[PDB]
């Protein structure tokens, strides 16, 4: 029942929410495991960059962010061809390549 | 329970006095009310336009707005445990200047005048209205006639 004055609230606890609860007590262990895997892969690929393949310059696709510049999924075939890089050799020498991206500009 | 009609129980309050029905005298219409006069409320049943509610009958308020035919007045109403100063619009028939304020105004003028006077004279004069003081000592002169006896009369039935 409403008290004197306050906000109308709609708590979404009308289901059996107590059976599906995600506690985060394994967060530090997860961070430690991810780190260990990261360093293990970095050691595995001996001289190669730890981050991975280089990626391209892209513009965010929205009025809210079109002023910013991201890191894209991969270089497209038009760019590879005009840069003189074969689409199959780029991946094995360290260039991320995707064929979906176009080039309007 | 009772009825919530606007004129319930007003058959004597809004009625006209004995042998005073008919045309409203024009002096009531020919009075001037300005902003801020203290004024009395007395509902008159002869005219039904702008009749005040029965709970303001006999109440005294202050004029705050003057209009073609009516006057807006601020009057206090006791509602349960609190008093609200609420403003109502009453047509000019049901209204009448309060004489409770003019006495104080005349007193103000008069004691201001007697304060301005005697200021050069340097004498002392009383302005505050003191309460009725106890009677002072005096002499009661008998003129040679002695006071007459008073005795209770004997009981004897009338009816």
């Amino acid at each position: 029942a409403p008290s004197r004055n306050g906000m109308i609230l709609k708590p979404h606890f009308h289901k059996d929410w107590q059976r599906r609860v995600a506690t985060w007590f394994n967060q530090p262990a997860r961070k430690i495991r991810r780190r260990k895997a990261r360093q293990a892969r970095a050691r595995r690929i001996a001289p190669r960059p730890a981050a991975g393949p280089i990626r391209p310059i892209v513009r965010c696709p929205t009025v809210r962010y079109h002023t910013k510049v991201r890191a894209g999924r991969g270089f497209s075939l038009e760019e590879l061809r005009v840069a003189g890089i074969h689409k199959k050799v780029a991946r094995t020498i360290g260039i991320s390549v995707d064929p979906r991206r176009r080039n309007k500009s | 329970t009772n009825t919530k009609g606007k004129r319930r129980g007003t058959r004597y309050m809004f009625s006209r006095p004995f042998r005073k029905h008919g045309v409203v005298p024009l002096a009531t219409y020919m009075r001037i009310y300005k902003k801020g006069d203290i004024v009395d409320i007395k509902g008159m049943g002869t005219v039904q336009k702008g009749m005040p509610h029965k709970c303001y009958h006999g109440k005294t308020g202050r004029v705050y707005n003057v209009t073609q035919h009516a006057v807006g007045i601020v009057v206090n109403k006791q509602v349960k445990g609190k008093i609200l100063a609420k403003r109502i619009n009453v047509r000019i028939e049901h209204i009448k200047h309060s004489k409770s304020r003019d006495s104080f105004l005349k007193r103000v003028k008069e004691n201001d005048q007697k304060k301005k006077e005697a200021k050069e004279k340097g004498t002392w004069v009383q302005l505050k209205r003191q309460p009725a003081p106890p009677r002072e000592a005096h002499f009661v002169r008998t003129n040679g006639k002695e006071p007459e006896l008073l005795e209770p009369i004997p009981y004897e039935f009338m009816a």
Binding site: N5, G6, M7, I8, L9 | -
Partner: protein, 187 residues
């Protein structure tokens, strides 16, 4: 038996700060002594305001301080505020002021020192002027908090411009029945 009422027998005002830090309590000791052994009431006011809570010591802005000290007659006097002096960015010219406050924002302090004024703390204020002559006692806007927009005469009631408690602002949240003559009634 005595015909009296004990409802309002006990007054509620603060006797000492609710805070537990030691610097404010030392200031309170000093100004307690000053107030009880000096006839000046400036010390009493300052000590009372030291007792007060955070929401009763609203911050004072640089623009407010310069505006209130630019008034005629109060030149080269020390502006005393028991709250926090925060910087105002929408003011370019800042004169030289002699400020005293419990704490001052870093940017505000930089601005005043660059302009050429000096910052005082209530201790040194005691040394400079124990009775506090040549002081302009200011305070921030106490009604500045947004909680005061929800107070007073209740909403949904004629001639009440009181902010309701709504979880989100939009066209679907408290706009239909009591707010329109088209749907029910308009207060």
């Amino acid at each position: 038996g005595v015909d009296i009422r004990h409802n309002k027998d006990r007054k509620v005002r603060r006797k000492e700060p609710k805070s537990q830090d030691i610097y404010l309590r030392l200031l309170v000791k000093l100004y307690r002594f000053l107030a009880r052994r000096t006839n000046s009431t400036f010390n009493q006011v300052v000590l009372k305001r030291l007792f007060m809570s955070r929401t009763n010591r609203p911050p004072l802005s640089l623009s407010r301080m310069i505006r209130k000290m630019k008034l005629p007659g109060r030149e080269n006097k020390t502006a005393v505020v028991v709250g926090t002096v925060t910087d105002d960015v929408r003011v370019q010219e800042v004169p030289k002021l002699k400020v005293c406050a419990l704490r001052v924002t870093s940017r505000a302090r930089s601005r005043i020192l660059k302009a050429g004024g000096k910052i005082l703390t209530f201790d040194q204020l005691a040394l400079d002027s124990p009775k506090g002559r040549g002081t302009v006692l200011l305070s921030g806007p106490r009604k500045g908090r947004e909680v005061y927009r929800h107070f007073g005469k209740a909403p949904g009631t004629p001639h009440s411009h009181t902010k309701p408690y709504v979880r989100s602002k939009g066209r679907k949240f408290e706009r239909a029945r009591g707010r329109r003559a088209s749907r029910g009634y308009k207060n």
